[PDB]
Design a protein around this ligand. Structure first.
Ligand SMILES: Nc1ncnc2c1ncn2[C@@H]1O[C@H](COP(=O)(O)OP(=O)(O)NP(=O)(O)O)[C@@H](O)[C@H]1O
Length: 419
C-alpha cells in the first residue's frame, strides 16, 4: 500500500509518502514562521504546500493519509471548522483552577494540567462565558485532517486523552459529556482507522485518488515512537536529545502523580514513559558537539570514572524522581575533560536506567530492548555505558521521523499492537 504521513511539529511540517511493498519513499518539508497572526492559515497552507511538493506520480498512487500534530495545540471552531479565536498552542498554559476539572475526569487524570486541551477548553468557556453547542474544539491533527475529509468533531484517542478522554474505558465521562462542554467534544476513533474518503475537490485539485482514505491521526511524540517500528511489550525508544525522553511499550497502563507519568492506549497495548530534566543541554553547557565527539572517543566505558554525577542543567528534577529542589551534582571536577565528560555520560546513563526501572516498578512490562533516537544516539561510548548499566540490547532506531511513523500509521494502523 502507498501511504502518506503528515507531521506537524514544533517548528515545521514534513510529508513522507511511502510505498511499503517496494520500500520506496519521498520526503518533503516546510519550515514554520517564527511569528504569525494567523497560525491556522499557516498550518493549512503548509498542508497544501506539502501536498504540492509531492510528485504527481506519488499523489496518484496514495491510498491512505494520516496526520500527527503537537499535543495540546487546540482550536475553537464553528460547526464548519472556522477558528473563532487564536489557537492555544502546546506550550501555552492557562491560569485556572484545576479543581474545576476534578468532577469531569478521574483522580490524577492526565488532563489535569494547565497546558492540557481540557484546561484550554475550560479557559475558553470562562473567556467566552458561554460556548455555542454547535461549536467544536479540535486538536491541530484533528483540524488538519478535517481539511481533507470534511467530517467535523472527529479526533483520536491519543489526542483526546488530555482533553479528558479515558482510553481504558474508551469514553469521556458522563459528567463531562452532560456538562456545557460536552457538545464541543469530538467523536473519538482509534488512530489509523479510516474516518472517511478524501474530499472530491481536494482529490481533483491535487491529483489524488478520489478513493483515498483519510485516517484518524495522533500526536508527534507517539508518531516518533511509531517510526521505530517497535510493537512488542517491553520494547522502548530512548530519545537522547536536549532532554532525555523515555517511551516504553507495556501490556499494562502505568501512571504516577508526582512525576507526571501517564500512559496512552496503543491498540491492545499501552505506551508509557517519562521525561527527565537531564539531557544533552547539560552536555552543551560544557562542550559543543565537535568536542563531544573528539572527547567521547577517548573514553573507556569499562573503567568507572569514580564520579557520581546527577547531570541536571539546573535546579529541579521532574523524572524519574520528582524533587523541585534537586541541584546539579557535578562534583568533584576532574582536571581531565575526558574524565569529566565520562562522568556526565555515566550520570545521564543513570538517569535512563533509573527511569526505565522506575517505569517497571510502577507496573510496566519489563524492558526487552532499547531503540535510540536524538542527538546522543550516535554516541557509541554512551551507548556502551547504557547497555552495561541497563542490561538489554540497545541499538539506533531504524527510523525516527514522526512523518514516517505517521505513514506507517496510515498504512497499517495499530494492528501490530495486539497479542
Ligand atoms: N556525540 C554526541 N554525544 C552526545 N550528545 C550529543 C552528541 N552530539 C550532540 N549531542 C547533544 O544532542 C543535543 C541535541 O539533541 P537533538 O535531539 O538533536 O535536539 P533536540 O533539541 O533535543 N530536538 P529533538 O530531536 O526533538 O529531541 C544537544 O544538547 C547536544 O549536546
Amino acid at each position: 500500500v502507498v501511504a502518506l504521513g503528515l507531521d506537524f511539529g514544533t517548528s515545521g511540517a514534513r510529508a513522507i509518502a511511502c510505498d511499503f511493498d517496494s520500500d520506496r519513499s519521498v520526503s518533503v518539508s516546510v519550515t514554520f514562521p517564527k511569528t504569525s497572526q494567523n497560525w491556522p492559515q499557516v498550518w493549512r497552507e503548509a498542508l497544501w504546500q506539502l501536498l504540492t511538493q509531492i510528485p504527481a506520480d506519488w499523489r496518484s498512487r496514495i491510498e491512505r493519509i494520516a496526520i500527527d500534530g503537537t499535543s495540546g495545540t487546540v482550536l475553537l471552531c464553528d460547526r464548519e471548522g472556522q477558528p473563532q479565536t487564536e489557537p492555544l498552542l502546546y506550550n501555552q498554559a492557562c491560569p485556572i483552577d484545576l479543581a474545576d476539572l476534578a468532577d469531569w475526569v478521574p483522580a490524577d487524570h492526565a488532563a489535569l494540567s494547565s497546558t492540557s486541551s481540557l484546561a484550554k477548553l475550560w479557559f475558553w468557556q470562562q473567556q467566552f462565558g458561554a460556548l455555542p453547542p454547535d461549536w467544536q474544539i479540535l486538536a491541530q491533527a484533528d483540524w488538519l485532517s478535517l481539511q481533507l475529509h470534511g467530517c467535523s468533531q472527529q479526533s483520536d484517542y491519543h489526542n483526546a486523552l488530555k482533553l479528558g478522554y479515558s482510553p481504558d474505558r474508551e469514553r469521556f465521562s458522563k459528567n463531562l459529556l452532560d456538562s456545557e462542554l460536552g457538545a464541543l467534544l469530538p467523536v473519538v476513533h482509534e488512530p489509523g482507522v479510516a474516518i472517511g474518503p478524501i474530499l472530491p475537490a481536494i482529490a481533483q485539485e491535487f491529483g489524488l485518488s478520489p478513493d483515498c482514505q483519510i485516517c484518524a491521526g495522533t500526536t508527534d511524540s507517539i508518531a516518533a515512537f511509531l517510526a521505530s517500528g517497535a510493537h512488542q511489550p517491553g520494547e522502548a525508544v530512548t530519545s537522547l536529545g536536549s532532554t532525555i525522553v523515555l517511551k516504553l511499550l507495556s501490556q499494562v497502563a502505568v501512571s504516577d502523580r508526582l512525576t507526571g507519568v501517564y500512559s496512552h492506549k496503543l491498540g491492545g497495548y499501552w505506551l508509557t514513559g517519562g521525561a527527565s530534566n537531564c539531557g544533552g543541554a547539560t552536555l552543551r553547557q560544557f562542550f559543543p558537539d565537535t568536542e563531544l565527539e573528539s572527547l567521547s572517543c577517548q573514553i573507556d566505558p569499562t573503567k568507572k570514572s569514580g564520579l557520581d554525577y546527577y547531570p541536571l542543567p539546573s535546579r529541579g528534577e521532574r523524572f524519574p524522581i520528582a524533587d523541585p529542589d534537586r541541584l546539579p551534582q557535578l562534583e568533584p571536577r576532574p582536571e581531565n575533560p575526558v574524565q569529566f565528560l565520562q562522568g556526565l555520560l555515566e550520570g545521564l546513563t543513570q538517569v535512563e536506567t533509573l527511569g526505565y526501572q522506575r517505569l517497571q516498578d510502577l507496573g510496566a512490562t519489563p524492558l526487552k530492548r532499547i531503540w535510540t533516537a536524538g542527538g546522543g544516539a550516535k554516541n557509541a561510548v554512551w551507548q556502551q555505558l547504557r547497555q552495561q548499566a541497563i542490561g538489554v540490547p540497545i541499538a539506533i532506531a531504524p527510523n525516527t521521523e514522526a512523518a514516517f511513523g505517521t505513514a506507517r500509521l496510515a498504512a497499517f494502523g495499530l494492528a501490530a499492537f495486539h497479542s
